[PDB]
Amino acid sequence: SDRVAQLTVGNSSITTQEAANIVLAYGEWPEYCPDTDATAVDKPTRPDVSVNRFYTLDSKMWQENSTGWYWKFPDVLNKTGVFGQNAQFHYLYRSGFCLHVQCNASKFHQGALLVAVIPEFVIAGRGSNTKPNEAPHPGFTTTFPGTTGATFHDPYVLDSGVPLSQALIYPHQWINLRTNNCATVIVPYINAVPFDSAINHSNFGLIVIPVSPLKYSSGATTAIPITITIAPLNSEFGGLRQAVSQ
């Protein structure tokens, strides 16, 4: 009554037979914007079925010498389906998310994955340069990876100068290959403004990081796949105009 679970959203479902508990980021449920916090005059749209379902991204390979992966979540679903079309045509966006990460293994493998969100996860530029007009800055495909993700260079400092030991202050879970084969984190809309654009601003970002490496004996399956399925709960869009991609 605690390890088996099923999450149905829209027309999509997710079943799991071994898992940890469902985390709720900062104890708040994602709901629609009230009339007190709202500031835009035009009425928003609410599909509530076509945009609130489980979108699955591609699979990342789990090997022995991996470093980690990170995504920018309001930017990964800008090319997929009706959510992407609404986020391209509209100008303001507000929604919560629900992130499931599946990485199953046998009873002879071992390892550990830290899966956490960071609100306003800023990428740093590696390089010792104290002059502001010459220092190295990250590219557009490094800051906004998209539906294909991006790997780390230094997971010890989260590519931001911040130790990943203290990354447990964020909403997080552990994929330990002997306890659970998946992780789930529900996240509300965390921002200092009621509505914001879903094109040039990414609220948060997931990070799967190998803490304990993947080890096994000869004969076991080598390549361990990693899949992430996400769901934009309670989506709201505003400011309908011409479609822009970026």
Partner 1 sequence: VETILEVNNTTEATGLTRLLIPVSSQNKADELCAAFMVDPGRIGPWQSTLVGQICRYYTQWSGSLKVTFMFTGSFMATGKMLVAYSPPGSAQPANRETAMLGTHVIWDFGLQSSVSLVIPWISNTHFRTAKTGGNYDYYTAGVVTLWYQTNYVVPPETPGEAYIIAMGAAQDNFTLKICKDTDEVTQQAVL
Partner 2 sequence: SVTNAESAANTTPSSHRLETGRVPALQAAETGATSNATDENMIETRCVVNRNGVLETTINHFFSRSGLVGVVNLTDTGYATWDIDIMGFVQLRRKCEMFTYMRFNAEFTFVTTTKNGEARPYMLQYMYVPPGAPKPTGRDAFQWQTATNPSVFVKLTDPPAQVSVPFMSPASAYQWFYDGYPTFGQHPETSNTTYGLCPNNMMGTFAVRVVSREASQLKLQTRVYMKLKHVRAWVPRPIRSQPYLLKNFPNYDSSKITNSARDRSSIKQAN
Partner 3 sequence: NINYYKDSYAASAFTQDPKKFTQPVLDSIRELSAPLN
21, 48, 67, 106: which one binds partner 1 (CB under 8 A):
106
Residue closer to partner 3 by CB (options 66, 173) is 173
Instruction: State the binding partner of 27 from partner 2, partner 3, its own copies, none, CB within 5 to 8 A by kind.
Output: partner 3
Is 158 an interacting residue with respect to partner 1 (CB under 8 A)? no
| C-beta of residue 95 within 8 angstroms of C-beta of residue 31 | no
Is 16 an interacting residue with respect to partner 1 (CB under 8 A)? yes
67, 81, 139, 151: which one binds partner 2 (CB under 8 A):
139
Look up tokens 């990170």; give the residue: 70
Q: How far apart are CA 99 and CA 115, in angstroms?
A: 10
Is 186 an interacting residue with respect to partner 1 (CB under 8 A)? no
The tokens of 104 are what? Answer: 């199953």
Is 7 an interacting residue with respect to its own copies (CB under 8 A)? no
Is 32 an interacting residue with respect to its own copies (CB under 8 A)? no
Residue closer to partner 2 by CB (options 217, 246) is 246
176, 211, 216, 240: which one binds partner 2 (CB under 8 A):
176
Residues 73-132 close enough to bind its own copies by CB under 8 A = 81-82, 85-86, 88-90
Q: How far apart are CA 123 and CA 130, in angstroms?
A: 17
Is 246 an interacting residue with respect to partner 3 (CB under 8 A)? no
| C-beta of residue 184 within 8 angstroms of C-beta of residue 118 | no
SS3 assignment, position 82: helix
> Mask: binding to its own copies, 39-78, rule CB under 8 A, as x and -?
---xxxxxxxxx----------------------------
Size of the site for partner 3 (CB under 8 A): 17
Other beta carbons within 10 angstroms of residue 69's beta carbon come to 21
Integer angstrom CA distances of residue 246 from 63, 83, 88: 33, 15, 8
Compute CA 234 distance to the chain's CA centroid, rounded to the nearest angstrom.
Answer: 16
Residues 115-144 close enough to bind partner 1 by CB under 8 A = none
| H-run or E-run covering 74 | helix 73-76
Q: How far apart are CA 31 and CA 16, in angstroms?
A: 25
| C-beta of residue 117 within 8 angstroms of C-beta of residue 230 | no
* Residues whose CB falls within 8 Å of the CB of residue 85, separated by 6 or more in sequence, listed in order: 243
8, 11, 13, 21: which one binds partner 3 (CB under 8 A):
21
* Residues within the interface to its own copies (CB under 8 A): 11, 42-50, 81-82, 85-86, 88-90, 237, 240-243
* Residues within the interface to partner 1 (CB under 8 A): 4, 11-18, 39-42, 53-62, 80-82, 91-92, 100, 102-109, 147, 181-182, 193, 195-197, 216-227, 229, 238-242, 244
